[PDB]
Coordinates of C-alpha atoms in Angstrom, one line a residue:
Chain A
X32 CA 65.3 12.1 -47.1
X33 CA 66.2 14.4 -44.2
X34 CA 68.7 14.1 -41.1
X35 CA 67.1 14.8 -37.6
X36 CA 69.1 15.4 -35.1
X37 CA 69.5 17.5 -31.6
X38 CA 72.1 20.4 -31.5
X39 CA 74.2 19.5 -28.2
X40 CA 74.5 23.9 -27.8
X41 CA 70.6 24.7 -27.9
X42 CA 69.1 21.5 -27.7
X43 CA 67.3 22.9 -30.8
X44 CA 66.2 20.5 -33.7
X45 CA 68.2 20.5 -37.2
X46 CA 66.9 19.1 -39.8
X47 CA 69.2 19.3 -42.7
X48 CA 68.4 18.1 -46.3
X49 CA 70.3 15.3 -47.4
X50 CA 69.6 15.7 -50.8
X51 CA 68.5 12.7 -52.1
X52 CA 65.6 13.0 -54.8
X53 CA 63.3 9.4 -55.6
X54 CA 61.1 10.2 -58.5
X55 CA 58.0 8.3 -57.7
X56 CA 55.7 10.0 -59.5
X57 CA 53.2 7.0 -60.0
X58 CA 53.4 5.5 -56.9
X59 CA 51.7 7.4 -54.6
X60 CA 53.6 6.1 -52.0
X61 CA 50.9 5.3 -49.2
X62 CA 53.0 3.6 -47.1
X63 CA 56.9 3.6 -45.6
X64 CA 58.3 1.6 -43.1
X65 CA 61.9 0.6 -42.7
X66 CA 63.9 -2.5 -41.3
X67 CA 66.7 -1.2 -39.1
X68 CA 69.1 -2.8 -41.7
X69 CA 68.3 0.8 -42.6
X70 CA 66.2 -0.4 -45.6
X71 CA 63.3 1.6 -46.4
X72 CA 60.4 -0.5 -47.7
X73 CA 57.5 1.5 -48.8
X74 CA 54.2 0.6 -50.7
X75 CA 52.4 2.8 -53.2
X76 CA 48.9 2.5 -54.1
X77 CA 50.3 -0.1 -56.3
X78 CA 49.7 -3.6 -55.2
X79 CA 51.9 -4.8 -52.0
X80 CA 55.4 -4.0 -52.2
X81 CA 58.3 -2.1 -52.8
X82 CA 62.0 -1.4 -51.3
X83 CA 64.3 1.9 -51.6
X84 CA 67.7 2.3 -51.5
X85 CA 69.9 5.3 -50.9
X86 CA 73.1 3.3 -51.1
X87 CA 67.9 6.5 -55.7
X88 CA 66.8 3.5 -57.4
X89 CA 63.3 1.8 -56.7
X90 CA 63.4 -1.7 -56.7
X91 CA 60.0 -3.5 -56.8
X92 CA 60.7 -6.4 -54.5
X93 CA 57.7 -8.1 -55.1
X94 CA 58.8 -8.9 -58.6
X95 CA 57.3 -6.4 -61.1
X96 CA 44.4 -7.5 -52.1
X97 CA 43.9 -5.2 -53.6
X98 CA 45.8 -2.3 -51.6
X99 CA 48.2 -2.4 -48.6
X100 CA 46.7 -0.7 -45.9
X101 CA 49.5 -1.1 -43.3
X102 CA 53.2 -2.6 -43.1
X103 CA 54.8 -3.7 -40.1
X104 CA 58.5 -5.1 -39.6
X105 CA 59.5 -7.2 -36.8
X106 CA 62.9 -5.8 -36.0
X107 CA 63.9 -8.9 -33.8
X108 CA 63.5 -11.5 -37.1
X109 CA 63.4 -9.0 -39.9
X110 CA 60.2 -10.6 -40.8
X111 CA 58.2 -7.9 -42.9
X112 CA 54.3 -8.3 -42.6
X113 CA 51.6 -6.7 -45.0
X114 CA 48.1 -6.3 -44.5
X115 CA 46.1 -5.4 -47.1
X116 CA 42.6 -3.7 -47.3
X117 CA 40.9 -6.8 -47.8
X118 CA 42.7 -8.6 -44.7
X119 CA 45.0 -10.9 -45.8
X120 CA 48.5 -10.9 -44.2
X121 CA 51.9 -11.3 -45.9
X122 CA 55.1 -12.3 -44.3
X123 CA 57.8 -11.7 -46.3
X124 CA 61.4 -13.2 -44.8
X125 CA 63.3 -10.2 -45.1
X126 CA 67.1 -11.3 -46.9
X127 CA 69.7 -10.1 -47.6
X128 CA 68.6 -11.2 -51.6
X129 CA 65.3 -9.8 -51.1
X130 CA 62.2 -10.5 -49.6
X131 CA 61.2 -14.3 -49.4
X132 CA 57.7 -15.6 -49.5
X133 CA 54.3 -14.9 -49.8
X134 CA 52.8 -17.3 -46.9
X135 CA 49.3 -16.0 -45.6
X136 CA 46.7 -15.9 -43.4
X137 CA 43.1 -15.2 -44.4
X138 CA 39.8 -14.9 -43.1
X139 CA 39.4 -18.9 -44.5
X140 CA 42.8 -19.9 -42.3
X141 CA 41.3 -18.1 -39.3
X142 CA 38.5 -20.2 -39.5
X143 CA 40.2 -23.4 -39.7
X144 CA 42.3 -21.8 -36.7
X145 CA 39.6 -21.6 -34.6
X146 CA 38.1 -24.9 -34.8
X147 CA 36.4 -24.2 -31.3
X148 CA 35.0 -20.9 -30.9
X149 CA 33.7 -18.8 -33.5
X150 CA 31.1 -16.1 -33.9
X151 CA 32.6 -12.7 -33.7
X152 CA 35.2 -13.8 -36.5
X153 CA 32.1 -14.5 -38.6
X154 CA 32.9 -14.1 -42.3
X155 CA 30.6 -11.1 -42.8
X156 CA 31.7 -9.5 -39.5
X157 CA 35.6 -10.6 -39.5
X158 CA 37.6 -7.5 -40.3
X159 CA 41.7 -6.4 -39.5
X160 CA 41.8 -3.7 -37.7
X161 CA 45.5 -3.5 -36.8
X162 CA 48.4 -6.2 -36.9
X163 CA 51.5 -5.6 -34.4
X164 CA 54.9 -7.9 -34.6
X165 CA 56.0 -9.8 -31.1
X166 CA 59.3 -9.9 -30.7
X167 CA 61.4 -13.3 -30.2
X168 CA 62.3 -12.0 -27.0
X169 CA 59.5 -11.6 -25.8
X170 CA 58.0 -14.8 -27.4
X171 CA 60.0 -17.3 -29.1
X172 CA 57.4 -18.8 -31.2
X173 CA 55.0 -15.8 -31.8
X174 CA 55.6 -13.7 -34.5
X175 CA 52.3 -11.5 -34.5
X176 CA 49.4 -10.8 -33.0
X177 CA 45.9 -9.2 -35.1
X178 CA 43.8 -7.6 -34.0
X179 CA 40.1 -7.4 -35.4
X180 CA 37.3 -4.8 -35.9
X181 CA 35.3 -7.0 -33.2
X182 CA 38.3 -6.3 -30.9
X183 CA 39.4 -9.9 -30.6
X184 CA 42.9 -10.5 -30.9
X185 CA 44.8 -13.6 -32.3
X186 CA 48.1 -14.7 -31.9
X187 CA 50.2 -16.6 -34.7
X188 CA 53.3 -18.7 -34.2
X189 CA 55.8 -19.7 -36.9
X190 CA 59.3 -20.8 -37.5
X191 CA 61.8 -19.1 -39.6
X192 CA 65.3 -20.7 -41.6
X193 CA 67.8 -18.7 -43.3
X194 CA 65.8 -19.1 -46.6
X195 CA 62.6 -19.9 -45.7
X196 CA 59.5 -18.4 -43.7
X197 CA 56.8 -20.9 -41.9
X198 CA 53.2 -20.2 -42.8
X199 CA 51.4 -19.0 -39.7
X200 CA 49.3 -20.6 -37.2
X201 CA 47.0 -19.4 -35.0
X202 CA 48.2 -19.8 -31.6
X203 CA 45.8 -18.3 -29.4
X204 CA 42.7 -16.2 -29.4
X205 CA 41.0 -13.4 -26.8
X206 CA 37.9 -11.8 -26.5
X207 CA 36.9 -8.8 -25.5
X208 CA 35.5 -8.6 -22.3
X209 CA 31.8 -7.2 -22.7
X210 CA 31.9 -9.0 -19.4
X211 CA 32.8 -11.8 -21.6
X212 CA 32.8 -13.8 -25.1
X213 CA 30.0 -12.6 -27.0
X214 CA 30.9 -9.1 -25.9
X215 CA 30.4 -6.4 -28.1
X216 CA 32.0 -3.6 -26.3
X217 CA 34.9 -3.4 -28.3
X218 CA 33.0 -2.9 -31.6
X219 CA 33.7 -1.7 -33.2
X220 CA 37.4 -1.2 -32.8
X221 CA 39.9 1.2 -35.0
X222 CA 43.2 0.6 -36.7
X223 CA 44.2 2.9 -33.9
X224 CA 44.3 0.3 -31.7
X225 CA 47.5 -0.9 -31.2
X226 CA 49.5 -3.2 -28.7
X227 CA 52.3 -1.9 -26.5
X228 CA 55.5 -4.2 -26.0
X229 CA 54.9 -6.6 -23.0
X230 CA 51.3 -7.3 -24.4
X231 CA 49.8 -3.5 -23.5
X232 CA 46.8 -3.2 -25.3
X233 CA 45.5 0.2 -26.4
X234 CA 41.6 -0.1 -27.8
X235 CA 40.4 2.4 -29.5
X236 CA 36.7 1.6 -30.1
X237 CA 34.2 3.8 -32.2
X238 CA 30.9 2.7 -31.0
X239 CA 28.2 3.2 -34.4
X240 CA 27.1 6.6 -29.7
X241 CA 30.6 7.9 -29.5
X242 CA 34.3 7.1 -29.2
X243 CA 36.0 5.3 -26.0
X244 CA 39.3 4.1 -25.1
X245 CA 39.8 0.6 -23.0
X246 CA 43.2 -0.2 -21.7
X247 CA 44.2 -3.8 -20.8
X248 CA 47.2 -4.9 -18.8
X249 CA 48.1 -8.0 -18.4
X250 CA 48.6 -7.9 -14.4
X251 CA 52.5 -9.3 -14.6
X252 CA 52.6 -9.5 -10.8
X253 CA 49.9 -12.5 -10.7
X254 CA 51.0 -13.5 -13.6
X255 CA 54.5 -15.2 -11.6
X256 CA 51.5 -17.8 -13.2
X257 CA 48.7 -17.5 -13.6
X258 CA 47.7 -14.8 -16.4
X259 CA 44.9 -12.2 -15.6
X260 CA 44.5 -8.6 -17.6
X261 CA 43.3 -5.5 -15.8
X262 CA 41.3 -3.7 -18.2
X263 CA 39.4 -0.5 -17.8
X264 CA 38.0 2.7 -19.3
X265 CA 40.1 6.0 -20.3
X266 CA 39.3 9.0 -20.0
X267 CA 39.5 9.8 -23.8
X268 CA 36.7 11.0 -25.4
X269 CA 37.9 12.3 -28.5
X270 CA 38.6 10.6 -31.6
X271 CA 41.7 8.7 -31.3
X272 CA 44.2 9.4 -33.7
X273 CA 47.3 7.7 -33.1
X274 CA 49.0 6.2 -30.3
X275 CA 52.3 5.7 -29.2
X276 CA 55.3 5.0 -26.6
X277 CA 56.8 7.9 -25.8
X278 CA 59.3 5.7 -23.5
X279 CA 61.9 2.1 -23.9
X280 CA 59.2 -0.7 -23.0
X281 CA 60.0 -2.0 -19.2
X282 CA 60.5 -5.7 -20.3
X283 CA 63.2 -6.8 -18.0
X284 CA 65.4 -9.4 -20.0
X285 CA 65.9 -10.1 -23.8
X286 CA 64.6 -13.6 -23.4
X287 CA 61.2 -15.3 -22.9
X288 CA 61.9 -15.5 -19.1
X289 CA 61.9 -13.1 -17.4
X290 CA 60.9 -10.4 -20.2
X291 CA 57.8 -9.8 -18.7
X292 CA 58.9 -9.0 -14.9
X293 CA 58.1 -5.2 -14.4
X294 CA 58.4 -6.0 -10.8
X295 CA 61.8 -6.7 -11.1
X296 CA 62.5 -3.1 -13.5
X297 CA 60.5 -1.0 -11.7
X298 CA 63.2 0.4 -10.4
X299 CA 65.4 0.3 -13.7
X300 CA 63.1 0.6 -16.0
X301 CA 62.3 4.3 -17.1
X302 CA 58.5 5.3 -16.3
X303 CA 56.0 4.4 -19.2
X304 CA 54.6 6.8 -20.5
X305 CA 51.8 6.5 -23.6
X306 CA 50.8 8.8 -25.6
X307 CA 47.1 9.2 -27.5
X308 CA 47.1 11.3 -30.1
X309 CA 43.7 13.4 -30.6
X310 CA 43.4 15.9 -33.6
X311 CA 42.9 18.3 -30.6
X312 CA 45.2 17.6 -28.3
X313 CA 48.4 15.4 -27.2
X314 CA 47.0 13.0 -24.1
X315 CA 49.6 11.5 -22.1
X316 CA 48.6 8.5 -19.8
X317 CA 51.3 7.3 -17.1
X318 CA 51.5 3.2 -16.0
X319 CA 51.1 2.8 -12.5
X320 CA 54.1 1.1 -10.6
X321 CA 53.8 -1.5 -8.0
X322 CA 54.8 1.5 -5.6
X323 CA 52.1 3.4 -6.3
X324 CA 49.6 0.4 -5.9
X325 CA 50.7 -0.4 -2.6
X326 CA 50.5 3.4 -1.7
X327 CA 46.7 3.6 -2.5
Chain B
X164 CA 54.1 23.3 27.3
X165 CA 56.0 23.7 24.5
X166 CA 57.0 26.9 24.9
X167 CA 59.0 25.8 28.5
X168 CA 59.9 22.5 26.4
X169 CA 61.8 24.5 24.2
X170 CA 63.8 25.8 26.3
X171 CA 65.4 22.4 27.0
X172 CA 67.2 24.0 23.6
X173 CA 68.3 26.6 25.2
X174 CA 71.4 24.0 26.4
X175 CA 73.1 23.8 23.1
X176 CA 74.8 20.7 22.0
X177 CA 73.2 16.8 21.1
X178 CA 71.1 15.1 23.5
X179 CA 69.7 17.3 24.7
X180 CA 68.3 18.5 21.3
X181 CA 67.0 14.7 20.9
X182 CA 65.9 15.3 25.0
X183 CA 63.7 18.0 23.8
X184 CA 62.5 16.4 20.8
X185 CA 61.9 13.3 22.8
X186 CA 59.6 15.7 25.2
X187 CA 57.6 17.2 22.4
X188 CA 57.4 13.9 21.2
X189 CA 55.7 12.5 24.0
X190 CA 54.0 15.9 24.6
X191 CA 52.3 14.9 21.2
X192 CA 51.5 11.6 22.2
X193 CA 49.2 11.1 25.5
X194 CA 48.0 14.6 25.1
X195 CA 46.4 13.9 21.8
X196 CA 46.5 17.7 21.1
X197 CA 46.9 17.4 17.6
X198 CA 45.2 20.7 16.2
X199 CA 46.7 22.7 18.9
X200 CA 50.1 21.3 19.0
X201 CA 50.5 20.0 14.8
X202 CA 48.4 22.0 13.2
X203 CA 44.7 22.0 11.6
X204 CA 42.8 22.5 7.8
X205 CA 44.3 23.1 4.3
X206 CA 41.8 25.1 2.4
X207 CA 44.8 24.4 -0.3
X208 CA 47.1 26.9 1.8
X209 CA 49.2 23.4 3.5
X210 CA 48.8 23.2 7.1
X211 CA 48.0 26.1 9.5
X212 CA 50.9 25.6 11.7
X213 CA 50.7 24.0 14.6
X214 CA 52.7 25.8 18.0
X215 CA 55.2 23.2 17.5
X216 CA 55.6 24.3 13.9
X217 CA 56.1 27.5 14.4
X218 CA 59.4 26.2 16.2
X219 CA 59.6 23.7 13.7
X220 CA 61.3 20.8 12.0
X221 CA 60.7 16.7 13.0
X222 CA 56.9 17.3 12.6
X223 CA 56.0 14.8 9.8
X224 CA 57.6 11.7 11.7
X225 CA 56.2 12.6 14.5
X226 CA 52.8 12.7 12.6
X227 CA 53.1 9.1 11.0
X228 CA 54.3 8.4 14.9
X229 CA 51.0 9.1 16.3
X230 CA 48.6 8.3 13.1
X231 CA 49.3 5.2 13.8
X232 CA 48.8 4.9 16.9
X233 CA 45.6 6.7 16.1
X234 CA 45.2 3.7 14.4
X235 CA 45.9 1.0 17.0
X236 CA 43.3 2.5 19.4
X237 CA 41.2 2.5 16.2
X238 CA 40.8 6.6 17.0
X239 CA 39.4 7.3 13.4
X240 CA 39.3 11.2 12.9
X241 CA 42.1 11.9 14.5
X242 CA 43.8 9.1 11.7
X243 CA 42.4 10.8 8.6
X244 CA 43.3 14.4 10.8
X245 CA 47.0 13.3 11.0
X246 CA 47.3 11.8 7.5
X247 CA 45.9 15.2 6.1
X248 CA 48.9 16.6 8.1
X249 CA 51.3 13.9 6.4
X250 CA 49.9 14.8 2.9
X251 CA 48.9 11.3 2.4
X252 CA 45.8 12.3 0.2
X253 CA 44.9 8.6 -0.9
X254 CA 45.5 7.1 2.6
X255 CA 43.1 10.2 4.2
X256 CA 40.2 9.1 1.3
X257 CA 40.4 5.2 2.1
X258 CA 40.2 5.6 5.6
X259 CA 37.1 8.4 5.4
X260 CA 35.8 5.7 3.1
X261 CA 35.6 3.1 5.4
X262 CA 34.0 5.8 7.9
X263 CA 31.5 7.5 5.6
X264 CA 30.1 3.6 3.9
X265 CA 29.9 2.3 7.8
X266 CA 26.9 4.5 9.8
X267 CA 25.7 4.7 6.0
X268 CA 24.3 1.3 6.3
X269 CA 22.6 0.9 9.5
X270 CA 19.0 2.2 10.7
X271 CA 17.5 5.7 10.0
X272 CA 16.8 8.8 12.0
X273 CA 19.7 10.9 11.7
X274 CA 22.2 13.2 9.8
X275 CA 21.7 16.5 10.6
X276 CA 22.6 18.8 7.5
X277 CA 25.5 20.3 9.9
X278 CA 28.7 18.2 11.1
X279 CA 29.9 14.7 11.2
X280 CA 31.6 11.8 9.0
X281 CA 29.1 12.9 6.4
X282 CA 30.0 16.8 7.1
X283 CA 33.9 15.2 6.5
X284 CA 33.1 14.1 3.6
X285 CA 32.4 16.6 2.1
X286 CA 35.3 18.6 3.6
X287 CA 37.9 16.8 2.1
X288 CA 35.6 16.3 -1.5
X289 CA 35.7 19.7 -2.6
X290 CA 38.7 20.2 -0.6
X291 CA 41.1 18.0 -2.1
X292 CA 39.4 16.8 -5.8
X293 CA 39.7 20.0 -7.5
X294 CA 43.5 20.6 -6.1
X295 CA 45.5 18.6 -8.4
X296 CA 43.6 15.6 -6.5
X297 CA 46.7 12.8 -5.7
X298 CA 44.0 10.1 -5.3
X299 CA 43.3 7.2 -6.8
X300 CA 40.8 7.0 -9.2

């Protein structure tokens, strides 16, 4: 474990040791995430879960699928997620005791979800991509939102207690736009892929020709309503490696209403600005303001 | 004109400064001598100046001023002239747009391969695109 920080006089980087060794020589530690608690929870190829604590010690939460592929946190309910490689979800309720649960959602609740539409979440075909936390603020009642290898994207609600998580239910469902429904632009679609707070989505889609990068955002301004998502090609070509925000997201408020109003923290609200990792290069995409809308 | 306009400066002290601007102003205006009296063609390089330019200052209100005007009388050329001179890139392609797609559909028999909205086009494609191109997409 190392400190970051910026020197003031430079504005140089230090980086100083803080020596604290973990021996965790069987893990193989594929995966570290943290809860701003400032617990580190990290998963080794060695079944789900696993929690560290500086104040050395491991401590295997999950009392000591098949791997877990990725771990999310949702800071606003310290709700921890797990996906594992064979797509099923875990929701831990993150206590101060320990981690409480595990509630999930499979390929078999999915279907039951649905009970309308179904097709592209076919059982041979249904794979998750990517799985990203919704804040309360944001949305009260949605914790998370996955996001498939068909590119679809499905919302869960649920209700926390103190101790006590809800099982998950899915809320909602969207499809990519080939045009519409059936489409199969977005396949297939990488773990890249990943949403951007205030419902941004970033698809990163691996076609069996060549790599292409959709962006979708939701237009807010309409959307004093009725909801509509501008969606549209990027320039990226190259294989997408990771993607991030290099700026705070513009929600406006801290609260369902209002969060969404980039109209009203244009001003305010630092530019966005996204960034695409590449292994050749850093790509950095800009949003477009209202200003700049009216000005074309 | 402008050179006995100036002159009007010659008196030092408010008033008449905005007296002479006022003059230019309406010299501008009516006279519609925009190459002459604003100024004419990037090739990158900004504007070539324009007499009044080379006396300088209020130049770009007095370019939205007249553009649109340009625009009330529906004078297109001398619109997507004057917004070149404003630096309003993306407002310059939308109008020539609008140009360049009407008298494309219509009946044939024309285009000569040497000057017109088509000839503009092309002007301001290779002009502006590979300069750091402020357009819209």
């Amino acid at each position: 474990i190392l400190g970051l920080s910026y020197a003031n006089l430079s504005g140089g980087m230090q980086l100083l040791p803080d020596p604290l060794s973990l021996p965790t020589d069987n893990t193989y530690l594929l995966t570290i995430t943290s809860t701003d608690n400032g617990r580190i929870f990290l998963a080794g190829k060695d079944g789900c879960l696993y929690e560290v604590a500086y104040q050395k010690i491991n401590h295997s939460k999950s009392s000591l699928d098949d791997p877990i592929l990725q771990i999310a946190i949702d800071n606003s309910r310290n709700i921890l997620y797990t996906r594992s490689e064979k797509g099923v979800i875990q929701v831990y309720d993150l206590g101060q005791d320990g981690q409480g649960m595990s509630a999930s959602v499979s390929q078999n609740a999915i279907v039951s979800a649905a009970g309308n539409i179904a097709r592209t979440i076919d059982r041979s075909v249904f794979k998750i991509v990517q799985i990203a936390v919704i804040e309360n603020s944001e949305s009260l009642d949605c914790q998370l939102l996955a996001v498939t290898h068909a590119g679809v994207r499905l919302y869960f609600s649920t209700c926390p207690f103190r101790a006590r998580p809800n099982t998950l239910t899915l809320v909602h469902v969207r499809l990519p736009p080939g045009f519409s429904a059936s489409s199969t632009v977005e396949k297939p679609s990488k773990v890249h892929r990943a949403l951007y707070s205030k419902g941004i989505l970033l698809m990163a889609a691996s076609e069996n020709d060549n790599d292409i990068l959709w962006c979708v955002n939701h237009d807010t301004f309409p959307f004093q309503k009725p909801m509509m998502e501008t969606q549209m090609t990027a320039g990226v070509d190259g294989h997408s490696w990771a993607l991030s925000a290099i700026d705070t997201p513009l929600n406006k408020d801290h609260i369902p209403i209002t969060d969404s109003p980039v109209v009203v923290q244009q001003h305010m609200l630092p530019p966005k600005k996204f960034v695409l990792l590449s292994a050749q290069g850093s790509l950095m995409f800009h949003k477009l303001r209202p200003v700049d809308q009216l000005r074309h | 004109a402008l050179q006995y306009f100036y002159f009007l400066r010659d008196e030092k002290d408010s008033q008449g400064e905005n007296m002479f601007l006022r003059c230019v102003s309406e010299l501008v205006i009516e006279s519609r001598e925009f190459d002459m009296i604003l100024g004419k063609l990037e090739n990158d390089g900004s504007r070539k100046p324009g007499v009044i330019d080379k006396f300088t200052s209020d130049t770009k209100p007095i370019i939205n001023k007249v553009a649109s005007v340009a625009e009330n009388k529906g004078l297109f050329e001398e619109a997507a002239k004057l917004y070149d001179l404003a630096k309003n890139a993306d407002k310059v392609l939308e109008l020539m747009n609008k140009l360049l797609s009407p008298v494309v559909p219509q009946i044939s028999a024309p285009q000569s391969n040497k000057e017109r909205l088509k000839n503009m086009a092309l002007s301001i494609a290779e002009r502006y695109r590979a300069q750091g191109i402020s357009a819209n997409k």
